[PDB]
Amino acid sequence: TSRIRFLMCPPDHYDVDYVINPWMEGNIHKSSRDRAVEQWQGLYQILKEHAIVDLVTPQKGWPDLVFTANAGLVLGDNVVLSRFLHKERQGEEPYFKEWFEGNGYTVYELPKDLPFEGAGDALLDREGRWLWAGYGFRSELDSHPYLAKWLDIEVLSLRLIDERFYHLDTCFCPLANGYLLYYPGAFDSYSNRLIEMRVAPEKRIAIAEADAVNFACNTVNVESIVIMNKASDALKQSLTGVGFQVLETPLTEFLKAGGAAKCLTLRVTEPVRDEVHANVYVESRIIRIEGHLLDSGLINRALDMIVDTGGSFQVLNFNLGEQRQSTSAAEVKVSAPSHEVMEEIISLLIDLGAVDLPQDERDAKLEPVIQDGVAPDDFYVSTIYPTEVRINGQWIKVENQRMDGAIAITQTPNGLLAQCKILRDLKAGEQVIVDVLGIRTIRVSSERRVELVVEQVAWELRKIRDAGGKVVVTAGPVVIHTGGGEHLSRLIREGYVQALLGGNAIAVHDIEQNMMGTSLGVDMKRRGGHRHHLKVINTIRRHGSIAKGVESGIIRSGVMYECVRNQIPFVLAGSIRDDGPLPDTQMDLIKAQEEYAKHLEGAEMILMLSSMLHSIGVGNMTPAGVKMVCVDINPAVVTKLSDRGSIESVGVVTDVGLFLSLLTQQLDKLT
Template sequence: MTETMANKATSIDTTDTTRILMCAPHHYDVDYVINPWMEGNIHRSSRDQAETQWQKLHDVLKEYAVIELIEPKPGWPDMVFTANAGLILGDRVVLSRFFHEERQGEEPHFQKWFEDNGYTVYVLPKGLPFEGAGDALFDRGGGWLWAGYGFRSELDSHPYLAKWLDVEVLSLHLVDSRFYHLDTCFCPLQGGYLLYYPGAFDAYSNRLIEMRVPADKRIAIDEVDAVNFACNTVNIDRTVVMNKATESLKQRLDELGFTVIETPLTEFLKAGGAAKCLTLKMSEPRSIETQTSTVQSRVIHLEGHLLDSGLVNRALDTIVSGGGSFQVLSFDLGKQRQDSSVAEVKVIAPDVTVMDDIMGQLIDLGAASLPREAQPAELEPVVQNGVAPDDFYVTTIYPTEVLIGDRWIKVKGQRMDGAIALSQTDSGPVASCKLLRDLEIGESVVVGSRGIHTIRELASLKSKKADEFSFMGAGVSSERRVELVVEQIAWDLRRIRDRGGKVVVTAGPVVIHTGGSEHLKQLIRGGYVHALLGGNAIAVHDIEQAMLGTSLGMDMKRGVSVHGGHRHHLKAINTVRRHGSIAKTVEAGELTSGVMYECVKNNVPFSLAGSIRDDGPLPDTKMDLIEAQADYARLVEGADLILMLSTMLHSIGVGNMTPSGVKMVCVDINPAVVTKLSDRGSVESTGVVTDVGLFLSLLVHQLSKLTGQYAPVDVLN
């Protein structure tokens, strides 16, 4: 901060007279491009025309205010836009820190003028952009300060404004690059009215505006007025001076008691400015009672192969798209290619709600608060069985820890879309991932985002062992050779089986229709399947084929419909219902082949989840949704790999209840299905876009070829 001169008290006008600072455009030109309006306008502005337009604006404003001038300096063509010089309140001014170097040379000239005129000048830390009254506007009704960020000013500057000017600051996130300063799309008017363009702001900012400004005082303009900078208006009492406005906007303002004065400023629009940009109001009323800033900040820690994995870019994009800002405090790339990277990033958000939203997404990415910044998790009690408190933390597939007191506790039963429930035991608190329906009175639930971090195993660049499986990275494999993907999957299936691991298959009826059942049966006989999940349909069609040679009435060998075949699936269902279960039908000798037969004979557990469209259903089908989900979760537990075969709903359901660390392969002819599974975020998932029958045929063939260390126990025929 620069101290004021001794005579400042006599230099500051304390009357109610409106005082405005302007700078003549003697050196004005469009010399560079630092906003979209400058594109295509380099040296296309007429200085004579600019002088004429500026003088007319000066003369209009002189009728309503005292105009003071700062001498323009050669080499700084944008000094004419004095709104960006700083932010003034009383005898204090926060000097601007320009974002672009093309304007940074203006700072000492404006600082000298402020000091010479008796202001106390506050200077922000170097490297913290803030562009004065272009991005900070006092409300004319509530007395708070609206402050913009996103393009020219950083969110982290707002706490300084609150402290130095003793004012409440409300932060607004600009998202349209045409409206790079707040004053290009936002103008508080006398009497608490607000002229603004909603399209320039994110959803949070629009909600904040609506919360603070009553509907009858909000004047939302259309794009046609916005691009003519109708919001870039000078408001003095009930007079508004602007470049141009549509008849409808002028009529609306007239109805509200405002006098509109239009004065063309087209030469300055070429540089992205108009009436408000050309003026800096030096007198602001003080009707402020609350002097606070709601801006929040936290430090996160990122570690891993940050550049190769794209994690650091995703984290920073998450912060900005979520309505926040950031500062990279440190970034160590490591010295060797295989070294991990470490970054510390300061996250800034306009309030605690936005911060919690951003932190929740960052936690999902694997970002953790540093120990010195970490605060214990916030807990709220369950007051109604099956209902979580508001703002409960929603879990992901990744292993999670919560900070309870001074102790990090690992969450048990990790899965997606649950809540973290805390219960007390004799050995201390226990944190568990629970579905909402399973929450009980007496438990506490983690809310917000404090004291939480996920453990992410980021892909390593180090050489893998010869037998280590890799799916060529996460994603959808629609262009790759299916044979190559199958070869990798076969290798992993053999390795999992031979070490006593667990493979779960989720399959749909398409497996039967495409002739894939013969190959799936061989996988079951060979010991490669340890649980089967599906719906009523796959079992019905499999049993129909085994008993009657048809699937949905189609002869599977000849590919033609069979007379009366449309009743075959009901006959199959009826037979099983007569015996009471699939296993009893096998025992009775009426079911002698097929996928379900092999499951029974090889002691492979299966679970069939029913739906409203099911015929029958089979006695084994669980028509209670909650019971079916629980049974699926039981069979998924401990899985090393899940093979999802042409069943969208069951695959997505299984994916949501599966923690990270479990490899997943989704095979479907529809790329939307495999994309959905890939989008869940696991780096150990892949999608194969192909016919499932072909895929299973290739898989069985590849398994039969494997020799050596993983020689088959049972040769597949």
């Protein structure tokens, strides 16, 4: 009971016979039988030095039977048998079932065509506190509640987003003493947030891509021992630094099929805790969608949105309608890994006209406005489409519909009024709809050039910083969108920027990217909703300033963060398109022009990072003798600002994120 047992399976009939993951591609019948046996023996014999190893009898025509991690998932006397997505591994299931039965396990089986691929996609916390379950490529989200019930454990769902890392055990490895070895880039932003909420920074060992493509997460952790294919020096240092002994043993013949040390093993003695019981965060809701579904492609668009947003589905029924022109209807069970993700999904499906089944219809939830111009937490975000809300069992029409507002419910002489209002117009005492119930709708430069300018600009930046001179940066939202924010905030942190001029939008998107890993609802990990965006605006308005957001601890990193922490002055000039705005945004443009002008005094260099109108405005204010550096793909903010002569104005037409990336790289070369 302090004795650890693994199940393995020798490579007697192993080869790459087909392609069902990206590693197998190109590798059919390219496995060396001798090297495969010798590598498998290396792992097997290392494991026997530290644990018990049982073997499954190998079987002709089922080569991936060697990957026993996928046989199923054992906890105590129970096993959930794997159901494989691909037919090429489905033939393994009877032989795995046979072994589990022969060894006295109580075998649970999922519904046919509900994929789940065992310990390879679901990894126990090494203290047995919860089960981490993957979805996205092989196991279905809807298998997770079954795992929770049958194995009687809390299950946390993680969404995989990189096809090379198609099982959770390829990119995620709980270790002894609460440590976690994993590759963040394999997960979406939601999942990364969950990992970080559950595992303290000191306990997280995030690996680099070079280690990840060697299957360094595909590790067998016995006690203080970790066994794997190969580890970089950096990774070895990290692991030994917290007390693991690292054992390497080559498994490249098995990497040819997309597996390594952990895939080749199934731990069948797992820690069972008395106090641990079933807990499910997956939730689901049945919707109905109606119209010309096949013809309009509407059902296809709804399902794709559900999946792209992080959820899952099961079409429960689909009815054609019995005349050639008549509408169709589908009832769809929608699933989500959390309430947060469900709300994002249901919000999108509402626009498409999805509605509740009568039996499930509920009134809209309401919360009070307590501060003028601030909505209550989790307010629903309106769209452009005509909308009705259910109050006291009655559906009423929303007035003054407009996207990106809140819906306020008030009482009047002639009954209830539902009104779409922008955040700043909300008044203390109004009731605002929150959650998502009771809402429906009714229908150019070369490589040489860039590199030369980067070289020159980096040299000048380091030179000016070192002499204690003044650099002003102007920046537009494209810096954040394109992926350049971390580079900018680094410039600001390391002393290269003495003032930042911009608008409302760059501050909102930067704070958004840092709080939720999105920008306009786009996961930086690879369209999307406005909910994250409006939540940011509302949160900063409720605190009252960006700096109070930093002080309260809700802004922990990014461009605006570093400006606050290093006391770099910034000015946000308003525009006609501003959402909110943030409290910090100067909506009196006479004043904004004055504040710009004042911060421009004494500037030796102005770095304009695709800031468009702010760039023009700053050029107009700036005398000759100031070095101007203008970066933009819009090849004529560039030519309109590079008109002051070449000796003092330099222009590049290129992606500003790429430019910033090359710039910070070059600054490092100068040391």
